[PDB]
């Protein structure tokens, strides 16, 4: 019954859908990408804090939400007068965020 040595020796875990998206964002945020759009047949489930981790340090935001949906917009002030706009379309119920759509683009 000393297989609990196996349990503490165990490496976990750790990946989650958010991590997987976050990793994509990493790519999609590069200076060379001018704009991307990702639509989800089945929405990408995510926790409130997982969602806050995906946003990381925007300068400003605005969101609007009629019916079950929230179009949430985020701004990242960049160099040479360029704003970066990230936008998440999502239903939330509750404490768990169901992203139906992510969009990115830049503006002067």
PDB file of C-alpha atoms in Angstrom:
ATOM      1  CA  UNK A   1       0.000   0.000   0.000  1.00  0.00           C
ATOM      2  CA  UNK A   2       3.030   2.238  -0.480  1.00  0.00           C
ATOM      3  CA  UNK A   3       2.133   3.214  -4.048  1.00  0.00           C
ATOM      4  CA  UNK A   4       1.276   6.691  -2.780  1.00  0.00           C
ATOM      5  CA  UNK A   5       4.978   7.228  -3.485  1.00  0.00           C
ATOM      6  CA  UNK A   6       3.888   6.848  -7.144  1.00  0.00           C
ATOM      7  CA  UNK A   7       1.157   9.467  -6.556  1.00  0.00           C
ATOM      8  CA  UNK A   8       3.450  12.145  -5.141  1.00  0.00           C
ATOM      9  CA  UNK A   9       6.123  11.355  -7.727  1.00  0.00           C
ATOM     10  CA  UNK A  10       3.444  12.005 -10.373  1.00  0.00           C
ATOM     11  CA  UNK A  11       3.822  14.995 -12.708  1.00  0.00           C
ATOM     12  CA  UNK A  12       0.645  17.037 -13.383  1.00  0.00           C
ATOM     13  CA  UNK A  13      -1.159  18.274 -15.268  1.00  0.00           C
ATOM     14  CA  UNK A  14      -1.747  20.869 -16.538  1.00  0.00           C
ATOM     15  CA  UNK A  15      -3.115  21.881 -19.934  1.00  0.00           C
ATOM     16  CA  UNK A  16      -6.595  23.304 -20.383  1.00  0.00           C
ATOM     17  CA  UNK A  17      -8.469  24.636 -23.441  1.00  0.00           C
ATOM     18  CA  UNK A  18      -7.630  28.220 -22.359  1.00  0.00           C
ATOM     19  CA  UNK A  19      -3.908  27.362 -22.419  1.00  0.00           C
ATOM     20  CA  UNK A  20      -4.396  26.064 -25.947  1.00  0.00           C
ATOM     21  CA  UNK A  21      -6.129  29.237 -27.071  1.00  0.00           C
ATOM     22  CA  UNK A  22      -3.664  31.383 -25.149  1.00  0.00           C
ATOM     23  CA  UNK A  23      -0.917  29.682 -27.142  1.00  0.00           C
ATOM     24  CA  UNK A  24      -2.704  30.497 -30.387  1.00  0.00           C
ATOM     25  CA  UNK A  25      -3.200  34.095 -29.288  1.00  0.00           C
ATOM     26  CA  UNK A  26       0.561  34.239 -28.639  1.00  0.00           C
ATOM     27  CA  UNK A  27       0.959  33.547 -32.363  1.00  0.00           C
ATOM     28  CA  UNK A  28      -1.928  35.695 -33.540  1.00  0.00           C
ATOM     29  CA  UNK A  29      -0.649  38.729 -31.608  1.00  0.00           C
ATOM     30  CA  UNK A  30       2.650  38.951 -33.444  1.00  0.00           C
ATOM     31  CA  UNK A  31       3.439  42.243 -35.197  1.00  0.00           C
ATOM     32  CA  UNK A  32       3.128  40.517 -38.593  1.00  0.00           C
ATOM     33  CA  UNK A  33      -0.460  39.368 -38.089  1.00  0.00           C
ATOM     34  CA  UNK A  34      -2.673  42.280 -39.195  1.00  0.00           C
ATOM     35  CA  UNK A  35      -5.905  40.478 -38.294  1.00  0.00           C
ATOM     36  CA  UNK A  36      -7.376  37.109 -37.440  1.00  0.00           C
ATOM     37  CA  UNK A  37     -10.841  35.780 -36.667  1.00  0.00           C
ATOM     38  CA  UNK A  38     -11.713  32.473 -34.988  1.00  0.00           C
ATOM     39  CA  UNK A  39     -15.296  31.155 -34.886  1.00  0.00           C
ATOM     40  CA  UNK A  40     -16.370  28.269 -32.637  1.00  0.00           C
ATOM     41  CA  UNK A  41     -19.143  25.820 -33.629  1.00  0.00           C
ATOM     42  CA  UNK A  42     -19.005  24.529 -30.059  1.00  0.00           C
ATOM     43  CA  UNK A  43     -17.929  27.390 -27.763  1.00  0.00           C
ATOM     44  CA  UNK A  44     -14.576  27.234 -25.988  1.00  0.00           C
ATOM     45  CA  UNK A  45     -15.397  26.764 -22.282  1.00  0.00           C
ATOM     46  CA  UNK A  46     -13.243  28.746 -19.889  1.00  0.00           C
ATOM     47  CA  UNK A  47     -13.227  29.929 -16.294  1.00  0.00           C
ATOM     48  CA  UNK A  48     -13.403  33.607 -15.299  1.00  0.00           C
ATOM     49  CA  UNK A  49      -9.757  33.643 -14.215  1.00  0.00           C
ATOM     50  CA  UNK A  50      -8.680  31.591 -17.229  1.00  0.00           C
ATOM     51  CA  UNK A  51     -10.334  34.391 -19.271  1.00  0.00           C
ATOM     52  CA  UNK A  52      -8.571  37.135 -17.300  1.00  0.00           C
ATOM     53  CA  UNK A  53      -5.273  35.346 -17.982  1.00  0.00           C
ATOM     54  CA  UNK A  54      -6.026  35.456 -21.722  1.00  0.00           C
ATOM     55  CA  UNK A  55      -6.424  39.221 -21.642  1.00  0.00           C
ATOM     56  CA  UNK A  56      -3.289  40.158 -19.678  1.00  0.00           C
ATOM     57  CA  UNK A  57      -2.778  43.917 -19.264  1.00  0.00           C
ATOM     58  CA  UNK A  58      -4.871  45.740 -21.859  1.00  0.00           C
ATOM     59  CA  UNK A  59      -5.010  49.520 -21.572  1.00  0.00           C
ATOM     60  CA  UNK A  60      -8.779  49.866 -21.883  1.00  0.00           C
ATOM     61  CA  UNK A  61     -11.924  47.897 -22.664  1.00  0.00           C
ATOM     62  CA  UNK A  62     -15.606  48.117 -23.378  1.00  0.00           C
ATOM     63  CA  UNK A  63     -18.236  45.424 -23.535  1.00  0.00           C
ATOM     64  CA  UNK A  64     -21.865  45.303 -24.570  1.00  0.00           C
ATOM     65  CA  UNK A  65     -24.334  42.472 -23.924  1.00  0.00           C
ATOM     66  CA  UNK A  66     -27.933  41.982 -25.050  1.00  0.00           C
ATOM     67  CA  UNK A  67     -29.684  38.661 -24.495  1.00  0.00           C
ATOM     68  CA  UNK A  68     -27.196  35.989 -23.358  1.00  0.00           C
ATOM     69  CA  UNK A  69     -24.326  37.464 -25.346  1.00  0.00           C
ATOM     70  CA  UNK A  70     -21.374  39.713 -24.498  1.00  0.00           C
ATOM     71  CA  UNK A  71     -19.213  41.284 -27.183  1.00  0.00           C
ATOM     72  CA  UNK A  72     -16.154  42.206 -25.188  1.00  0.00           C
ATOM     73  CA  UNK A  73     -13.506  44.477 -26.625  1.00  0.00           C
ATOM     74  CA  UNK A  74      -9.906  44.997 -25.427  1.00  0.00           C
ATOM     75  CA  UNK A  75      -7.346  47.628 -26.392  1.00  0.00           C
ATOM     76  CA  UNK A  76      -3.574  47.351 -26.391  1.00  0.00           C
ATOM     77  CA  UNK A  77      -1.771  50.641 -26.946  1.00  0.00           C
ATOM     78  CA  UNK A  78       1.321  49.871 -29.021  1.00  0.00           C
ATOM     79  CA  UNK A  79       4.310  51.723 -30.477  1.00  0.00           C
ATOM     80  CA  UNK A  80       3.987  54.308 -33.275  1.00  0.00           C
ATOM     81  CA  UNK A  81       0.355  55.190 -32.456  1.00  0.00           C
ATOM     82  CA  UNK A  82      -1.105  51.733 -33.134  1.00  0.00           C
ATOM     83  CA  UNK A  83      -3.942  50.341 -31.036  1.00  0.00           C
ATOM     84  CA  UNK A  84      -4.514  46.590 -30.920  1.00  0.00           C
ATOM     85  CA  UNK A  85      -8.152  45.492 -30.654  1.00  0.00           C
ATOM     86  CA  UNK A  86      -8.963  41.996 -29.386  1.00  0.00           C
ATOM     87  CA  UNK A  87     -12.660  41.070 -29.253  1.00  0.00           C
ATOM     88  CA  UNK A  88     -14.442  38.116 -27.587  1.00  0.00           C
ATOM     89  CA  UNK A  89     -18.036  37.133 -28.274  1.00  0.00           C
ATOM     90  CA  UNK A  90     -19.347  34.955 -25.450  1.00  0.00           C
ATOM     91  CA  UNK A  91     -22.201  33.592 -23.388  1.00  0.00           C
ATOM     92  CA  UNK A  92     -21.545  33.139 -19.695  1.00  0.00           C
ATOM     93  CA  UNK A  93     -23.349  30.738 -17.411  1.00  0.00           C
ATOM     94  CA  UNK A  94     -22.235  31.227 -14.836  1.00  0.00           C
ATOM     95  CA  UNK A  95     -18.742  31.837 -13.708  1.00  0.00           C
ATOM     96  CA  UNK A  96     -17.845  29.767 -16.818  1.00  0.00           C
ATOM     97  CA  UNK A  97     -17.293  31.695 -20.032  1.00  0.00           C
ATOM     98  CA  UNK A  98     -18.370  30.130 -23.326  1.00  0.00           C
ATOM     99  CA  UNK A  99     -16.508  31.880 -26.146  1.00  0.00           C
ATOM    100  CA  UNK A 100     -18.211  31.688 -29.516  1.00  0.00           C
ATOM    101  CA  UNK A 101     -15.855  34.073 -31.315  1.00  0.00           C
ATOM    102  CA  UNK A 102     -12.457  35.763 -31.155  1.00  0.00           C
ATOM    103  CA  UNK A 103     -11.306  38.525 -33.435  1.00  0.00           C
ATOM    104  CA  UNK A 104      -8.147  40.606 -33.588  1.00  0.00           C
ATOM    105  CA  UNK A 105      -7.074  43.697 -35.522  1.00  0.00           C
ATOM    106  CA  UNK A 106      -4.990  46.900 -35.330  1.00  0.00           C
ATOM    107  CA  UNK A 107      -5.996  50.591 -35.688  1.00  0.00           C
ATOM    108  CA  UNK A 108      -4.176  53.948 -35.832  1.00  0.00           C
TER     109      UNK A 108
END
